[model samples]
Target: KVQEQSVGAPPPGRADKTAAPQTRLTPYAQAGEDNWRSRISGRLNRFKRYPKDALRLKRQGVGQVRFTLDRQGHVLAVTLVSSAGLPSLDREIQALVKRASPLPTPPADAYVNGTVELTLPIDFSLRGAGF
Candidate 1:
């Protein structure tokens, strides 16, 4: 619920010449993307839940989900990029995002006017599996 992937590869350029040296282009993009990612999912966390069956059965896995967000933070195509092995758990995540409509506003830097792509990790587990 309350918690926190993409190989965003930026070009390699001379470091000494950079004004911010902040990985400028991509870093700014990536950081801003992260800001929105954190924001949207921060809201997602509030509505998300652990599927009891998955927990009782002690099923576990980490999955990736991709969704589109607009300048206003509206989401689209709330899709699952991968699954948690268990269909129920996978559906839970998809539904979770759908439930969190009009997620937190996207950071300005993240979206100037159009929509941007986003992804988040969906991890579920029975920590110690003591049962």
Candidate 2:
């Protein structure tokens, strides 16, 4: 199983507390687990049925990777907040994410700065696969 972790929220006071949390689908720096669950789940489901060791290795499970999404919803920076202890697995996940391309753009008012947090899970195991 891929262990997941979050890239901590932006420094305090950076957010406009006065602004009502907008569901503008705009750029937000901290996309919570629930928010990203659907996309990540779909990716993991595809990873499970992948053929070949290399491909299997690629989708075989989950790992925690943290990346910053740009204002336009493009990936700006990625950092391994935690490792699944598999370098190949980690690298593959990073590559897949970058390749996934055309990320969902948050609503304009979602963020005042035009950026959002994104967290996705990578799972390697099958339906019954254990972590």
Candidate 3:
């Protein structure tokens, strides 16, 4: 299963430039965070279900998927740098990332640009992976 929570506010390291005209800052609220997290988490979680042709892998592990999140937050050209050593598992992860649609387009100057990194986790238990 995949779980995601949007961080309230632009991350801590990001500078708050609400006063500056060119600095595009998102509102400080749970809604934006919720939206961001949902998009990412939803897609990731769906991977728990494996297609008929593939055998799901067991074990809980993390896969670092690197891709350019367009200004619109859509993932583009995702690649799996490190694998959990399961072909079926890797395919499911890539499928989820490819299917994801980005959040609303950020303002031209928003802090998150075309380059973004998202870390994803895949969990499998003795009960069995998602069908």
Candidate 4:
């Protein structure tokens, strides 16, 4: 006969506390990213209208502005990447962008950095310049 004792053990296999979840990308997912850009730009276009003096002066310019968007869809800051030569035309567009704040939220994975920058063209066309 023999007397024996046993001790509780933690299996020693895994604490697993360090395990992290990950996401895998797919072929069509990238196309979705581009689509998000299109969607946001179109939203801005809807808010656009030829400025008053711009129409009165028959001013037409395509100014490119750079700005960043936060996760909540707010524009962080705006600066002219390319000027359209007409000061008012370019300046007013900045205000126009601000007016369209709280714009559409981006796709879940699109604005992954918590913010993203966009260089958008503010097109002022005389064709639709309502006298």
Please give, for residues 1-74, the per-residue lDDT of candidate 1 as tens digits: 11211345554455566644544554433334335545665666566644545554654446676666655556
- Ranking the candidates on TM-score from highest down gives 1, 4, 2, 3
Candidate 3 regions off by >4 Å? 1-35, 42-61, 101-114, 117-131
Model 2 segments more than 4 A misplaced: 1-35, 40-59, 70-73, 105-107, 126-131
* lDDT by candidate, in order shown: 0.53, 0.47, 0.44, 0.53
Listing every candidate in turn, what is its Cα RMSD in Å to the true structure after a full C-alpha superposition? 12.8, 13.9, 13.1, 11.7
Cα-lDDT of candidate 3: 0.44
Off by over 4 Å in 4: 1-59, 98-105, 126-131
TM-scores, one per candidate = 0.50, 0.45, 0.40, 0.48
* lDDT tens digits by residue: candidate 3, 7-124: 4444334344664443444342212434554454544444443432333334323455555455555666565666545444445444555555243434343334434444443333
Task: Evaluate model 1: give its lDDT.
Answer: 0.53
Clashes (candidate 1): 0
Instruction: State the lDDT at 46 in candidate 1.
Output: 62
Candidate 4, residue 40: the lDDT equals 60
